[PDB]
């Protein structure tokens, strides 16, 4: 029975996400050389992936383990949807915020240099969490309270909210993160032309892991809302949902493997 | 010449000193430490009402 | 160093006036400022305070909301705005310097004063009202308070001032033991934390005047009635 | 706690002035200026602008402020006073690139600076100065360089070379040989913590302030990309 | 040259023989029997966090409550250590300050650094603001250390290899002390202020009579530059810290090394040194960002102060021994018990 593979995979996923995002949090708490206004965004990302592995992954795993049946209260399904939609969206907006941070660091380099504090860090990090709450809030506004909302399963169901929340959470941040990394890369080319290598490699890894985790989910998910008649396999919907959460395990890796001071700490 | 001249005079000035045997001089540091050990809040941490550097 | 008050004179009661005080020869922005009354032939009475950089303001209840105190550091200037007035308000008003940090002496310098003529608290008491005495003799003057002035930090917030005839007051002692700068070693003070003494080891003709105690444990600041020394 | 409350408030007034100064201390770039006795750095400072132990030259480019510290009356044992400059945005090292026997001493100084344990993080901007004199000496054929750098005749102009229009093959081989003799030092023990930015410059060129501005912009880009983990 | 150099070498050998003739024990033998300092924990009771750049120096007022601290931001700050209040912040004329002192009265503080001038600031002005009373200009290399004897005279140390004593009213060198060969790094006054001792980038320390202007004794045994120096509280021994990673203690009276303080894993230079009020503890501040507390009789490491993120640059124990403060290139000071 594949529910056992979903349990084992769920425990491995929760382990990987909790461990990896704890390594971030403990390192930036303990090493003052890591405690930079640049790394503030990387902690804010890891914090979303920790809350997602605490407040959301265990119930998603338990649901998938009982074959996608929901057997708990309807308001717990509503809470779990609002919690998932916020913490998923916080993770994505934190990837987008890191991409603004890296762009300003190359586009306007003298203003960025360790002058950090209220205006960039606290405005932009606050905007990620607040805007994630704003995306999630229509779930606790009770759009699930409509007729025919069968309690035997847990999901979003409003076509309009699914389109607009997908549009806001994936479909605007994906172009922003792409154009910001393209403009960051082009900014380094302008600089190497004007003054008359690792950055040429890492931006493909950052963008690749984002697109591979989140394009399959958000395209499948918006396909259902655009097309109720489309015969999406339920196991596809499961698999792309799992693949969305794989991002929370890759985030610790991608935002600290390349960084020389995290590399220096993890050499110990 | 004045460089070597002032060296040999300064060296004579340091040669003619009434140096004392190190056992006695060491014992005097040991005696001073004992005599003032009661008076040293780093050596003997005082109770919190006497320490002006209390916690908030 | 100078403080020079301006405005004053005749007021009809329901009217209004603005006192100004102009500072020179000191770094005015660094000091908090106080205004102090002296009603005619009566003791001192504090009215208002502003901090360095205006961050705190206090008033006596006899003036709260009815007077307002204001500042102009770029012009080394202090103001008091008298929104409506009474027979209760005729006094000389002194502009007074103060600065607060560990070991500082606030109230150390006072302006010449300007006269305005109109057409719980810690109670502070001096048992004496006058003492007749001659030069070279020693004296004591005593003061007592309704609350102890000994704070838990170990300070004792008692200030002693002398005013000579026709002068503004001068600081003698800022906390019971601490003698001011530029005053004779002849003055010395001490106390229990609820009753207090100012002592003079030997008098001189320069000591003739009225001696005021004042607390600075908490606002409103309160003076004793003042003890005269007479020849 | 009335006096302590006022002492805390003036401590806050000080912290406001410290944070107002943290802004300018962050915003300005500090540059240690170094060179031999025969170096022309005392002319470079005029190009920047237009018993005392240190000189501060102030200049700006594109509204970015530079303080350049030419270390003044000090002895020839830098190993102690140099530790102060563990802060700086860059070192600027200035050399009479003018075929001296003393060019070997300038290479020994550059090696001593580049390998100093307190300077491991700090980039050197490198000015090969007075190259108008190098051009005059080499065009006159009175240059001696192989006679005390016994590898110039074996060395040849790199494809890295980008000479100015009309510069002679010997003049260009000479400037780039001297340039590479410094880079042969920096590339040996440099590990990407710090970089060397060589330039060719003369007693009168205006571009020195732009050379500094461009190279601090590069040094700051490398610092920012290191903080991002992107370089 | 040679005819005097043979007498100089003879006298150096004679002095070494005289030191050796006095070596009837070692302090490690005399103190072998006494009980150790039981290992001392200390906790950061205050942290002072105003400075914009690396702290180079700090000094306590005689009241054991106020302290003054200097940094490359170009500021002195005076701290009420009990409340953590900033009592004054003084903008310096040169950013590159390397040293700092109180007058024993608390009326004045002094600075010096890479501008060779020693600047003296008057705290007790009628005008309320702190201002420079005088600039002592006659040094020809950086000031490394300043100490007041009283409000009218200060002893100073420099990279020009001299120490000098000044009259503050005149602004003039009342005496100059010249026997050092390297940059003089630090001073300490004896408790009576009749003597002072200094160490100077030539692995040697010199004792001087303030009142005569002459070197009285010379001390050697370091492998490298002396950064730090401090009298033991009885006033007739002193300790030094150096780039060779050893602290070392000497008597004046026995005129030689008593103890070396080192441990095999301590590879790095000592920036600063001080003693507890009994003399029983050395405290030494190091590169590798921490302080070691030593039993100044037994030479055991009695404890560690671990709180700093960058180089510990200075130490000072209050005159009543009630605390130690550490300053650092991390721009903080921390106060310990
Ligand atoms: C960075 C990596 C190593 C973190 C760990 C990811 C692991 C736990 C992931 C990667 C691929 C995942 C599997 C992909 C697809 C499915 C089908 C689904 O209907 C049940 C769960 C199951 C079988 C997943 C379980 C979890 C899984 C094994
Ligand atoms: C479920 C909801 C309510 C939880 C919201 C928690 C949010 C606000 C928390 C979680 C992690 C936090 C961040 C963790 C680390 C840093 C780095 C520091 O240099 C600035 C603050 C900053 C950027 C924090 C800001 C607030 C933060 C983003
Ligand atoms: C409930 C949990 C799992 C979700 C949030 C993750 C945790 C680990 C977050 C929440 C608050 C965060 C801390 C808050 C702010 C700071 C200060 C900053 O200078 C360094 C990072 C540091 C120290 C953060 C580390 C990570 C942190 C502890
Ligand atoms: C992991 C921590 C930090 C956060 C999540 C806590 C979870 C496990 C808690 C929060 C609310 C809880 C539920 C609250 C109410 C009910 C209804 C009851 O008839 C069966 C148990 C059930 C369904 C609980 C199971 C456990 C539960 C889902
Ligand atoms: C830091 C914050 C975000 C942590 C939140 C903790 C989680 C476990 C809390 C937040 C909101 C809570 C839910 C709010 C309302 C209800 C309806 C009630 O009839 C059953 C329990 C249930 C479904 C709660 C279960 C626990 C819950 C999901
Ligand atoms: C929730 C979060 C992710 C929303 C982010 C909104 C984006 C579009 C905003 C936030 C901050 C903005 C940047 C702030 C500063 C600059 C520098 C300027 O020279 C070019 C534009 C640029 C780079 C801005 C472009 C737009 C920007 C990146
Ligand atoms: C971008 C990569 C992953 C390839 C997939 C492209 C996406 C955009 C494609 C794949 C399948 C498509 C859907 C297939 C069928 C229908 C039903 C039709 O009546 C309206 C359009 C709609 C709803 C399409 C919208 C676009 C769609 C979702
Ligand atoms: C590597 C990633 C991008 C793979 C995922 C691509 C997505 C867009 C693809 C994979 C499988 C596809 C589905 C396969 C089968 C059907 C049934 C048909 O009646 C309507 C379209 C529909 C529902 C397709 C829509 C697009 C789809 C969901
Ligand atoms: C972006 C890429 C690399 C993600 C990983 C590969 C994807 C394409 C794989 C992983 C798990 C796979 C699914 C697993 C199970 C089923 C059920 C089966 O009856 C039809 C195919 C379907 C629905 C598979 C389609 C392809 C799938 C989604
Ligand atoms: C990888 C988890 C993805 N979740 C899936 C919903 C779940 C089903 C069962 C348990 S949790 C989405 C739901 C839709 C949505 C959205 O429209 C906008 C922003 C975020 C999300 C999050």
Residue D187: CATH number of its domain? 3.40.50.300
Q: Chain C 30-49, CB below 8 Å of chain E: which residues?
A: 30-31
Q: Is E2 exposed, middle or buried (0-12, 13-18, 19+ CB in 10 A)?
A: exposed
After which residues, if any, is chain C broken (C to N > 2.5 Å)? 119
A66 lines ligand 7 (CB under 6 A): no
Give the C-alpha separation, A98 to A255, whole Å: 9
Going by their DSSP bridges, the two strands E143-150 and E131-136 should be labelled as unpaired
What is the CA angle E242-E296-E235, rounded to 5? 85
The enclosing domain of B29 has a CATH number of: 4.10.260.10
Give the C-alpha separation, C167 to E318, whole Å: 44
Q: Which residues of B touch E (CB under 8 A)?
A: 1, 4-5, 7-8, 10-15, 17, 19-23, 25-30, 32-33, 36-37, 39-43, 45-46, 51-55
Ligand 1 centroid from CA A48, angstroms:
20
Atom of ligand 3 nearest to the CA of A34: 20
D113 alpha-carbon distance from chain centroid: 11
Provide the token pair at C110: 């006072």
Give the C-alpha separation, A113 to D221, whole Å: 8
Phi and psi dihedrals of C139, rounded to 5? -140, 160
Q: B: neighbours with 3+ CB pairs under 8 Å? A: E
Count of domains observed in chain B:
1
Going by their DSSP bridges, the two strands E214-220 and D29-35 should be labelled as unpaired
- Cβ(C71)–Cβ(C79) under 8 Å? yes
Q: How far is A245 from chain D (nearest CA, A)?
A: 24
A219 lines ligand 7 (CB under 6 A): yes
Give the C-alpha separation, C50 to C99, whole Å: 11
Provide the token pair at A205: 């890894």
Q: Which residues of chain C have a CB within 8 Å of the CB of E80?
A: 101-102
- Residue D7 is assigned to a structural domain of this protein: no
Q: How far is E60 from chain C (nearest CA, A)?
A: 14
Give the C-alpha separation, A17 to E118, whole Å: 59
Q: Which domain holds residue B22?
A: 1-53
- Cβ(A31)–Cβ(A59) under 8 Å? no
Closest by CA position to C104, among listed E106, D139, E186: E106
Tokens 């560690």 — which residue?
Answer: E304
Closest by CA position to D160, among listed D149, D152, D172: D172
Question: What secondary structure, in 3-state letters, does D101-168 show?
Answer: CCHHHHHHHHHHHHCCHHHCCCCEEEEEECHHHHHHHHHCCCCCHHHCCCCCCCCCCCCCCCCCCCCC
Mutate to test the interface with E, among C97, C98, C103 (most CBs of E within 10 A): C103
Q: Which domain holds residue D91?
A: 34-227
- Cβ(E15)–Cβ(B15) under 8 Å? yes
A71 lines ligand 4 (CB under 6 A): no
- Cβ(C157)–Cβ(C143) under 8 Å? no
Give the C-alpha separation, E159 to D77, whole Å: 9
Report the DSSP beta bridge partners of residue C183. none
Q: Do C6 and C113 belong together in one domain?
A: yes
Pocket test for ligand 8, best of A171, A210, A223, A226 (most atoms within 8 A of CB): A223
Query: How many C-beta atoms lie closer than 10 Å to residue B43's C-beta?
Result: 23
In which element (H, E) is residue B11 found?
A: helix B2-15
In eight-state DSSP terms, residue C166 is: T
Q: Is C7 exposed, middle or buried (0-12, 13-18, 19+ CB in 10 A)?
A: middle
Peptide bond into C220 cis (omega under 30): yes
DSSP string of chain A, one letter each residue: -THHHHHHHHHHHHHHHHHHHHHHHHHHHH-TTS--TTHHHHHHHHHHHHHHHHHTHHHHHHHHHTTT---S-HHHHHHHHHHHHHHHHHHHHHHHHHHHHHHHHHHSHHHHSS--SIIIIIHHHHHHHHHHHHHHHHHHTTGGGSTT--TTS-----HHHHHHHHIIIIITHHHHHHHHHHHHHHHHHHHHHH----HHHHHHHHHHHHHHHHHHHHHHHHHHHH-TTS---HHHHHHHHHHHHHHHHHHHHHHHHS-HHHHHHHT-
Task: Give me the half-sphere count of Cα atoms (radius 13 Å) on the Cβ side of residue A118.
Answer: 2
Q: Which residues of chain B have a CB within 8 Å of the CB of E279?
A: 29, 32-33, 36
Count of domains observed in chain C:
2
Give the C-alpha separation, A125 to A42, whole Å: 10
In eight-state DSSP terms, residue E190 is: -
Q: A: neighbours with 3+ CB pairs under 8 Å? A: D, E
Give the C-alpha separation, D221 to A190, whole Å: 13
Provide the token pair at A244: 């969305």
Measured CA distances, C100 to C49, C197, D12 (Å): 13, 24, 12
Give the C-alpha separation, C52 to C36, whole Å: 17
C1 and E CB contact within 8 Å: yes
Radius of gyration of chain D (CA): 21
Closest by CA position to C72, among listed C29, C8, C132: C29
How was this entry determined?
cryo-EM
Q: Is A243 exposed, middle or buried (0-12, 13-18, 19+ CB in 10 A)?
A: middle
In eight-state DSSP terms, residue C87 is: G
Q: Do C71 and C139 belong together in one domain?
A: no
- Cβ(D54)–Cβ(D69) under 8 Å? yes
Q: Which domain holds residue E95?
A: 1-336
Give the C-alpha separation, D179 to D194, whole Å: 17
Measured CA distances, D39 to D70, D103, D209 (Å): 12, 10, 17
Going by their DSSP bridges, the two strands C77-82 and E237-242 should be labelled as unpaired
Tokens 């002005």 — which residue?
Answer: E125
- Residue D70 is assigned to a structural domain of this protein: yes
Provide the token pair at C115: 């006269």
Count of domains observed in chain D:
1
Ligand 9 centroid from CA A222, angstroms:
18
The enclosing domain of E168 has a CATH number of: 2.130.10.10
- Cβ(E102)–Cβ(E120) under 8 Å? no
Radius of gyration of chain E (CA): 20
Q: Which residues of chain E have a CB within 8 Å of the CB of D54?
A: 94, 96, 114-115
Tokens 């018990």 — which residue?
Answer: E337
Report chain D's terminal Cα–Cα distance, integer Å: 54
- Given in angstroms, what resolution was this structure solved at? 3.2
CB-based contacts of E280, cutoff 8 Å, min separation 6 = B33, B37, B40, B43, E37, E295, E296, E297
Measured CA distances, E54 to A129, C156, D71 (Å): 36, 38, 19
Report the DSSP beta bridge partners of residue E335. E46, E325
Nearest ligand to the CA atom of A240: 9
- Residue D23 is assigned to a structural domain of this protein: no
Give the C-alpha separation, D195 to D93, whole Å: 13
Query: How many C-beta atoms lie closer than 10 Å to residue B45's C-beta?
Result: 15
What is the CA angle D203-D146-D184, rounded to 5? 70
D12 and C CB contact within 8 Å: yes
The enclosing domain of C219 has a CATH number of: 2.60.40.10
Count of domains observed in chain E:
1
Q: Is A164 exposed, middle or buried (0-12, 13-18, 19+ CB in 10 A)?
A: middle
């Amino acid at each position: 029975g594949q529910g056992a593979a979903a349990l084992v995979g769920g425990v491995l996923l929760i382990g990987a996400v909790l461990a990896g995002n704890s390594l971030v949090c403990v390192s930036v708490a303990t090493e003052r050389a890591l405690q930079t206004p640049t790394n503030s965004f990387i902690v804010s990302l890891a914090a979303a992936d920790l809350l997602l592995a605490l407040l959301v992954l265990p119930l998603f795993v338990y649901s998938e383990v009982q074959g996608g049946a929901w057997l708990l209260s309807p308001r717990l399904c509503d809470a779990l949807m609002a919690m998932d939609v916020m913490l998923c969206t916080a993770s994505i907006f934190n990837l987008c915020a890191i991409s603004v941070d890296r762009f300003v660091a190359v586009a306007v380099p003298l203003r960025y240099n360790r002058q950090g504090g209220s205006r960039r860090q606290l405005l932009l990090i606050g905007a990620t969490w607040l805007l994630s709450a704003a995306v999630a809030a229509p779930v606790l506004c009770g759009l699930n309270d409509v007729r025919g909302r069968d309690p035997a399963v847990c999901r979003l169901e409003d076509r309009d909210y699914v389109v607009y929340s997908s549009v806001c959470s994936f479909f605007l941040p994906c172009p922003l993160m792409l154009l910001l990394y393209w403009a960051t890369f082009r900014g380094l080319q302008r600089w190497e032309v004007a003054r008359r290598r690792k950055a040429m490699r890492v931006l493909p890894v950052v963008v690749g892991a984002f697109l591979l985790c989140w394009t399959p989910f958000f395209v499948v998910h918006i396909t259902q809302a655009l097309c109720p008649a489309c015969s999406v396999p339920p196991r596809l919907v499961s698999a792309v949902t799992w693949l969305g959460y794989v991002n929370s395990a890759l985030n610790p890796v991608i935002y600290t493997v390349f960084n020389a001071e995290f590399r220096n700490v993890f050499r110990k | 010449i004045a460089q070597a001249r002032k060296l040999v005079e300064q060296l004579k000035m340091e040669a003619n000193i009434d140096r004392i045997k190190v056992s006695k001089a060491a014992a005097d540091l040991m005696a001073y430490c004992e005599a003032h050990a009661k008076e040293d809040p780093l050596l003997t941490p005082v109770p919190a009402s006497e320490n002006p550097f209390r916690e908030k | 160093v100078q403080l020079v008050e301006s405005g004053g004179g005749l007021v009809q009661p329901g009217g209004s006036r603005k006192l100004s005080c102009s500072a020179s020869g000191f770094a005015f922005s660094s000091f908090g400022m106080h205004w102090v009354r002296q009603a005619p032939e009566k003791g001192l009475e504090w009215v208002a305070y502003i901090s360095s950089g205006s961050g705190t303001i206090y008033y006596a209840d006899t003036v709260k909301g009815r007077f307002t105190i204001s500042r102009d550091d770029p012009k080394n200037t202090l103001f008091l705005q008298m929104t409506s007035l009474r027979s209760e308000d005729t006094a000389m008003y002194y502009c007074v310097r103060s600065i607060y940090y560990y070991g500082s002496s606030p109230f150390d310098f006072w302006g010449q004063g300007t006269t305005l003529t109109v057409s719980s608290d810690i109670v502070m008491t001096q048992a004496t009202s006058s003492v007749p005495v001659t030069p070279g003799e020693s004296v004591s003057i005593s003061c007592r308070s309704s609350k102890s002035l000994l704070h838990s930090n170990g300070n004792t917030y008692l200030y002693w001032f002398l005013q000579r005839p026709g002068q503004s007051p001068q600081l003698l002692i800022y906390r019971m033991s601490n003698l001011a700068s530029g005053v004779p070693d002849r003055f010395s003070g001490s106390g229990s934390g609820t009753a207090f003494t100012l002592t003079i080891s030997r008098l001189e003709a320069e000591d003739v005047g009225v001696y005021y105690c004042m607390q600075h444990l908490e606002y409103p600041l309160t003076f004793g009635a003042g003890t005269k020394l007479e020849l | 706690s009335a006096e302590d409350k006022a002492a805390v408030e003036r401590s806050k007034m000080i912290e406001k002035q410290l944070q107002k100064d943290k802004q300018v201390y962050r915003a300005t770039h500090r540059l240690l200026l170094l060179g031999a006795d025969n170096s022309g750095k005392s002319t470079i400072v005029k190009q920047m602008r237009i018993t005392s132990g240190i000189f501060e030259t102030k200049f700006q480019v594109d509204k970015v402020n530079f303080h350049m510290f030419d270390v003044g009356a000090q002895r020839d044992e830098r190993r102690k006073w140099i530790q102060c400059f563990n802060d700086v945005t860059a070192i600027i090292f200035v050399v009479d690139s003018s075929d001296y026997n003393r060019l070997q001493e300038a290479l020994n100084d550059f090696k001593s600076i580049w390998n100093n344990r307190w300077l491991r993080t700090i980039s050197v901007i490198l000015f090969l100065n007075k190259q108008d004199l190098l051009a005059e000496k080499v065009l006159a054929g009175k240059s001696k360089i192989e006679d005390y750098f016994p590898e110039f005749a074996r060395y040849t102009t790199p494809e890295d070379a980008t000479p100015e229009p009309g510069e002679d093959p010997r003049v260009t081989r000479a400037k780039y040989f001297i340039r590479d003799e410094f880079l042969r030092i920096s590339t040996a023990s440099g590990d990407g913590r710090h970089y060397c930015y060589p330039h060719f410059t003369c007693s009168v060129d205006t571009e020195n302030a732009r050379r500094i501005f461009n190279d601090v912009t590069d040094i700051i880009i490398k610092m920012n990309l290191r903080d991002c983990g992107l370089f | 040259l040679d005819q005097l150099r043979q007498e100089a070498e003879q006298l150096k050998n004679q002095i070494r023989d005289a030191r050796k003739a006095c070596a009837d024990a070692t302090l490690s033998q005399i103190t072998n029997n006494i009980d150790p300092v039981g290992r001392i924990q200390m906790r950061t009771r205050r942290t002072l966090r105003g400075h914009l750049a690396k702290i180079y120096a700090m000094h306590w007022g005689t009241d054991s409550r106020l302290l003054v601290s200097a940094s490359q931001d170009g500021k002195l700050i005076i701290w009420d250590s009990y409340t953590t209040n900033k009592v004054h912040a003084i903008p310096l004329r040169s950013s590159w300050v390397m040293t700092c002192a109180y007058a024993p009265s608390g009326n004045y503080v002094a600075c010096g650094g890479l501008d060779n001038i020693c600047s003296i600031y008057n705290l007790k002005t009628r005008e309320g603001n702190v201002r420079v009373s005088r600039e002592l200009a006659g040094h020809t290399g950086y000031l490394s250390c300043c100490r007041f004897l009283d409000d009218n005279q200060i002893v100073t140390s420099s990279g020009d290899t001299t120490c000098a004593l000044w009259d503050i009213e005149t602004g003039q060198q009342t005496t100059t002390f010249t026997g050092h060969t390297g940059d003089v790094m630090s001073l300490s006054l004896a408790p009576d202020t009749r003597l002072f001792v200094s160490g100077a980038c030539d692995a040697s320390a010199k004792l001087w009579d303030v009142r005569e202007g002459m070197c009285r004794q010379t001390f050697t045994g370091h492998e490298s530059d002396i950064n730090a120096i401090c009298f033991f509280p009885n006033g007739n021994a002193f300790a030094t810290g150096s780039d060779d990673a050893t602290c070392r203690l000497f008597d004046l009276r026995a005129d030689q090394e008593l103890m070396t303080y080192s441990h095999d894993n301590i590879i790095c230079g000592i920036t600063s040194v001080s003693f507890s009020k009994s003399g029983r503890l050395l405290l030494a501040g190091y590169d590798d960002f921490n302080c070691n507390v030593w039993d100044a009789l037994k030479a055991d490491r009695a404890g560690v102060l671990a709180g700093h993120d960058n180089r510990v640059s200075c130490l000072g124990v209050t005159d009543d021994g009630m605390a130690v403060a550490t300053g650092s290139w991390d721009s903080f000071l921390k106060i310990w018990n």
